[model samples]
Target chain A: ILDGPYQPTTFTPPIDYWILINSNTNGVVYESTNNSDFWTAVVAIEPHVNPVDRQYTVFGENKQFNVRNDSDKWKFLEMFRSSSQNEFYNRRTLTSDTKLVGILKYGGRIWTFHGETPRATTDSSNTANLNDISIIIHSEFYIIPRSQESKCNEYINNGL
Target chain B: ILDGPYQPTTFTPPIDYWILINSNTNGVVYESTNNSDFWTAVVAIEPHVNPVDRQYTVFGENKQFNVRNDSDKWKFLEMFRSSSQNEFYNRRTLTSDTKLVGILKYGGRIWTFHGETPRATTDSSNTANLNDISIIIHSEFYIIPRSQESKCNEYINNGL
Candidate 1:
């Protein structure tokens, strides 16, 4: 995925409440309303420049945040092969296998996160198991809801 | 994915008002309401026996429907790596690529279909392009809404 030009941008989250997950452990690391430092909501900015690529500036909190790798420890629930495929790297490869992909185990439109990890082959547990092959634990970014915290965590921690 | 036992069961569709797409043409082939010959609403039956696998029987319309390959010509909006992964075959391999998954092109909770076809490599025309490699046209089954018609078709017929 390529990056869009850096410029002023604004956005409104489609959903209000949100949650954050560890792309590594496949656990619900934080929630917007769970008394955490997480953002109450999340949104993406529309590119004002031409040749908009996968990378783009998110809304500003006095400053525009350029999304890169999941360095922020912020993992978003990117649906497999869905619009958020470009949110991180190797979305297609990450979710390539059915035995992996978390969203596949949990039913419905409940936003779910699937990531990559080296430990994937060894871990047969529910959450961490939904992954492709990776050499180390890393994170990615995605989006979702509050009431969905347990629901999301449920699939992550327990098989469907 | 394997098959579960043949036994009596029940199910309640997570949503009502659904659409059926042609896995071949990537077109809105049928709608529960659009003056079509499709099922009004669709649902699946849970397995009654142990060692439940991917395949299972749906509710009966006087006679129970045992879902096989897309022989019924019933294509469903199975999301990529999302739950309906087992409705057909080679799901993991089918959605192995990023650019080829339909749900990824369209956004949100909208249930979408991704199928296989040899024509995939040759097509760059949107819906039909969201596919894996297959020698002939085949279909699968999935679930979803009414107001979401043009929305679903938009992504299928047009690119993200």
Candidate 2:
């Protein structure tokens, strides 16, 4: 298997609300069914001059965070692809074969200083397993709402 | 630099009619100016099996797809990044340190079997320059629309 190098600039997802939902249940509430203690919403970033304003800015995150607890099966529910309406999902415990970039399993979930979420990952079960997708690159990751409505009309295109 | 492996799953952008308007202009034509011959849009994806339906599918590509004469200046505009808006630009030539996964320059542009602008990446000046971020292991590159309306309460955030 020719595993190519991670292109930091390309894979960073825009900072936004992604559903950190539970796959165990056919469906679960983003609020309760899958609470903060279980999963943390992750995003990525790096430095880039805002094209129009020309203001230099860093995106998403680089600070320490975790993808802790491989226990309770939770999945990362991502929105559709830009030209195709297709929902996607990722396993929280996945690493090695194919993995979640900009995300961490610090052996734990991402937390916030705001809300009941209280900006965590500051304290984790272990930092050894921390996965920082924004290492020495022109990109970064910022935190976003771990929740939302499907932003696009996602009818499965029959044209496929 | 110990570059990580490309996480094919995290970067699928929502499908939308994003305007690829020239940043130097004001009133948007949405489709015209900054025509397709010189510019192209690219994004990434991986095989998706609907957890519920378990349907297998491929994600986002470029070629005979225009990118011909670099007459005009344009870039792929993306939607749905929470909090702050983001503008990402890609060059017809880029590689090594950072790259686009699931996205391909295909050497230059996406080739659709139709359109003068009919889905193309042009014949290109050189074939060896084609970079298909799509790796066979789990991902592929795709092409899509360049412009859309805020389907996701995008206006309220007052960012875009």
Candidate 3:
């Protein structure tokens, strides 16, 4: 819990940053409008294996957040892939090394384009395209053990 | 709650950095051992009135937190007061301007000194002394309505 317990003139509290790991693909999905630049009718998230604990945190709306699994999260939380397969999103050649994507506000929420995404013009290729990826709403997922299992279960089952 | 609510085609989530404001003095207190250099036997926190919403955040254990109400919290979240009333800690000349206090691991947890604390050699004088203030275990306090009132009410009553 965010508020911690006290012990012997001391106390133990949760770390300021919470650790988040993806539960594999298909856990969550979002609709995409862009058919080009690796966009599809329905964009799905890829499996992020690496952990997001100590990586650089991207701040949005003056708040900070950890990126999803990938070098995007690890290499640099602020760095976003600008070009994939020789295609540049903002015409920035050093996109991979560029800290271009700072914070994005979409769907009435703040987010960053992190993780590998699907790109077109060369088949449905899979690569670490930070700019091409479909971003997930951090609030949609819950932190491990911090959330009640019933909440997640209810969403999945819809009280079937 | 950390887990936020979703809106139509969008979602509203809690910011990565939570806003914390001191309720007022007498809300919390801690015992101190040092009686010199502005230290008192029982170090009580002064009233902090500013709202810590967008001020710089201090990181501990790789986690982040806002400082108490004071210029210390507002001036620079990372800066700590070194010389108070002509008394210096760690022999730093630019004490107020020095970010000497980073992450402190005490009581088996991570923390940093913030706010104005009482120092000796003076007749109980007060100023914006970042280093002189007594530190609070962040976990001991709860966030606003995010936390139920019963928890705080019960703590004060102690089942009496």
List model 3 lDDT by residue over A1-160, tens digit each.
3221111111111222111222223221222111123321111222354433222212111112232444432122222222222321211111122221122222322232343221101011233332323333221222323233333223222211
TM-score of each: 0.20, 0.20, 0.19
Q: After best superposition, candidate 3 residue A148: deviation in angstroms?
A: 20
* Model 1 agreement with the true structure over A1-160: per-residue lDDT tens digits: 2121112111122332322223333322211111111122221222232322332111111212233232322233221112221222222122211122232222212233444332121111122222221111112333335445554344343423
Docking class of 3: incorrect
User: What value does DockQ give for candidate 1?
Assistant: 0.01
- Angstrom error at residue B103, model 1: 5.7
Query: Deviation in angstroms for A150 in model 2?
Result: 18
Q: Tell me the tens digit of each residue's lDDT in model 3 across B1-160.
A: 2211111111111112111222222221221111233321111222353543222212111212232444442121222222333321121111122211112212222232343221101011233322223333221232212133232223222211
Ranking by lDDT: 1, 3, 2
lDDT score at residue A127, model 2, on the 0-100 scale: 27
**Candidate lDDT (C-alpha), each:** 0.25, 0.21, 0.23
lDDT of 3 at B151: 29
Note the chain A TM-score of all models in turn.
0.19, 0.16, 0.18
Window of ten residues with lowest summed lDDT in model 1 chain A: A29-38
lDDT of 2 by residue, A91-124 (tens): 2221111112222122233322111111112222
